[PDB]
Design a protein around this ligand. Structure first.
Ligand SMILES: [Ca+2]
Ligand SMILES: [Ca+2]
Length: 333
């Protein structure tokens, strides 16, 4: 057995972690976990911190179930100057790399702080660096961190709000195993699970006749359509998405039923042009959203996100029919 979420730390990062001392990282973690619970819909597990004298004074390792998923530096008396893309010149110091987004970074002394801000850098203290890293890792592994016990804790906490919904569904109609796999499927594709009533209502309707967690994932995502549409396109602005070629769509649809399919070279064209469309979206300031026909969403999501996990494959039945959609990137032959 192992801690589902841990952090080993060298002796200079003990202060920010020690409650008796300043404990500044303690409060940043507590705020990360509560912002995460009200955004993504489940409270991430407590981070068990311990000291490891095998670690260099200023190094830390963020672990999950005993497996290292992160590591980096943090110097208590110094600051991390980050190039957000626009910064100019450089600064004396250790020229490392941002732990979360990989941006270029310099560890400057405290007296060079205003120098960095004038040169366009973003300056943060050491605890802010560890907290940013851990926050980015919790989001990336939110599905893996949502374990079976976390589903039970979520079910208990929710049974107070919707008692008729939870006892008459789990485990008589939907087992904790099936409900956990479904919620995990949503989290793996960055769909929030705040709206447990909609989720549980939906599973209550379909799970009698449909026990496969993947088929139930599709009908729950549709039920969460407004939450999905609003997360990537907040407000009333224009919905800028990747779509694929009309012919390609029908040709992809033929291959799934009778007819088809496409040459394996075109399957690799499909992958390369998705990478081209992806890079075009961030150039346009658009979101990395590929919008396809419902019968193609589960297929393209598994097929593309295997190598392009940053991609978000939404479905036409999930996108709110009241918003204006412009295809701003294509996927052809
Ligand atoms: Ca409703
Ligand atoms: Ca729709």
């Amino acid at each position: 057995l192992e801690d589902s979420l841990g952090m080993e730390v060298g002796y200079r990062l003990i202060p920010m972690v020690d409650f008796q001392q300043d404990g500044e990282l303690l409060g940043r973690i507590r705020s990360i976990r509560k912002k995460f619970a009200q955004d993504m819909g489940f409270l991430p597990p407590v981070v068990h911190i311990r000291d490891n004298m095998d670690l260099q004074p200023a190094r830390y390792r963020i672990l999950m179930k005993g497996v290292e998923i992160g590591s980096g530096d943090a110097y208590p008396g110094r600051w991390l100057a980050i190039n957000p893309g626009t910064a100019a010149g450089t600064l004396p110091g250790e020229k490392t790399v941002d732990p979360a987004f990989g941006l270029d970074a310099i560890w400057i002394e405290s007296a060079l702080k205003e120098q960095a801000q004038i040169q366009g850098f973003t300056v943060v203290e050491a605890s802010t660096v560890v907290a940013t890293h851990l926050n980015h890792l919790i989001g990336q592994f939110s599905a893996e961190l949502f374990g079976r016990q976390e589903a039970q804790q979520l079910l208990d906490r929710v049974s107070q709000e919707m008692p008729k919904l939870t006892e008459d569904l789990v485990p008589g109609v939907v087992t904790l195993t099936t409900l956990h796999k479904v919620l995990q499927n949503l989290l793996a594709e960055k769909v929030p699970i705040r709206d447990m009533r909609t989720i549980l209502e939906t599973l209550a309707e379909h799970a009698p006749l449909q026990s496969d967690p993947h088929e139930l994932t599709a009908v729950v995502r549709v039920a969460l359509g407004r939450a999905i549409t609003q997360q990537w396109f907040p407000g009333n602005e224009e919905v800028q998405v990747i779509g694929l070629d009309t012919a390609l769509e029908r040709l992809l649809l033929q291959a799934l039923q009778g007819g088809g399919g496409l040459e394996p070279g075109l399957a690799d064209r499909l992958l390369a042009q998705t990478q081209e469309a992806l890079s075009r979206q961030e150039m346009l300031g658009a979101p990395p959203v590929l919008l396809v026909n419902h019968a193609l969403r589960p297929l393209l999501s598994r097929f593309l996100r295997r190598s392009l996990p940053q991609l978000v494959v939404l479905s036409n039945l999930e996108l709110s029919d009241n918003r204006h959609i412009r295809m701003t990137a294509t996927i052809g032959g």
